[PDB]
Write a protein that binds this ligand. Structure first.
Ligand SMILES: O=C1OC[C@@H]2N1[C@H]1CC[C@]2(O)CC1
Length: 282
């Protein structure tokens, strides 16, 4: 079925939970043996969210190459994404090592450091120009260059220096700051505006490594971001945009990381975002 009228048909019939459970039943199950090794316990935020072995990002290190991060490679859309958990106190150096080694231009953050009165990820970037951060375990230096605070999101320019080689690179930090502590946004308008700002920066384009996108677990809000982006790109590429099947795209993405889209409300919000976004594109 088309999307907008399939949407109204699920609303009128109140069957979002059943649709979402079907997706959960059909989703891929691949091994995640490296994630579960005892030496990696303090590298995982949640015991039930792990990268598959076949798609995990490897650190360029011989001691321990493990990070909780997955490469989502979308062949028809010609887009790739790295989805990862919010960094932990003992993985902030690994996080920036990955950004460096994968040649990423942009980092997309969809959570606040504290939500619901608890810490959802480490404070992993510097908050003042004159107070830079050094990660001694991976030999990187990170400096805040500029910050632009808007009503729904903040964009930061960062300098990452590989201290072994003295090479430097400019990284863009796109921070969506207004996702509610509970539920999903009422309108997709600010989320779509944010997506378009990330696109306009070059951070999603083939002349760079894959964008790094995270929330707390790296599957819920993060899944919504890449699902909406890929569906909109396919609607532009194809002769028949009504042939784009959001459930099929989501199942394709779940071949590369488990659990993408965590609730039926996040599934409905993803439909809403793609529907509204397709009208603005034209
Ligand atoms: O190989 C790809 O690339 C992208 C996904 N896919 C097939 C199935 C679902 C898609 O979204 C479109 C066709």
């Amino acid at each position: 079925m088309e999307m907008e009228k399939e949407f109204e048909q699920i609303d009128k019939s109140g069957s979002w939970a059943a649709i979402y459970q079907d997706i959960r039943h059909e989703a891929s199950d691949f091994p995640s043996r490296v994630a579960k090794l005892p030496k990696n316990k303090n590298r995982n935020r949640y015991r039930d969210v792990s990268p598959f072995d076949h798609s995990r990002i490897k650190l360029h290190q011989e001691d321990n190459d493990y990070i909780n991060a997955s490469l989502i490679k979308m062949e028809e859309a010609q887009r790739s994404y790295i989805l990862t958990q919010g960094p932990l106190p003992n993985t902030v150096g690994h996080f920036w090592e990955m950004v460096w080694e994968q040649k990423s231009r942009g980092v997309v953050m969809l959570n606040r450091v504290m939500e619901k009165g608890s810490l959802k990820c480490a404070q992993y970037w510097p908050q003042k120009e004159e107070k830079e951060m050094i990660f001694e375990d991976t030999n990187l230096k990170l400096t805040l260059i500029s910050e632009d605070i808007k009503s729904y999101y903040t964009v930061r320019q960062l300098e990452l220096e590989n201290l072994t080689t003295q090479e430097t690179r400019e990284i863009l930090h796109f921070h969506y700051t207004t996702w509610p502590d509970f539920g999903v946004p009422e309108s997709p308008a600010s989320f779509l505006n944010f997506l378009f700002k990330v696109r306009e920066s070059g951070s999603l384009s083939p002349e760079h490594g894959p964008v790094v996108v995270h929330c707390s677990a790296g599957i819920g809000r993060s899944g919504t971001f890449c699902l909406a982006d890929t569906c909109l790109l396919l609607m532009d590429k194809r002769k028949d945009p009504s042939s784009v099947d959001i459930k099929k795209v989501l199942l394709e993405m779940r071949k590369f990381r488990m659990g993408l889209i965590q609730t039926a409300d996040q599934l409905r919000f993803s439909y809403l975002a793609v529907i509204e976004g397709a009208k603005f594109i034209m």
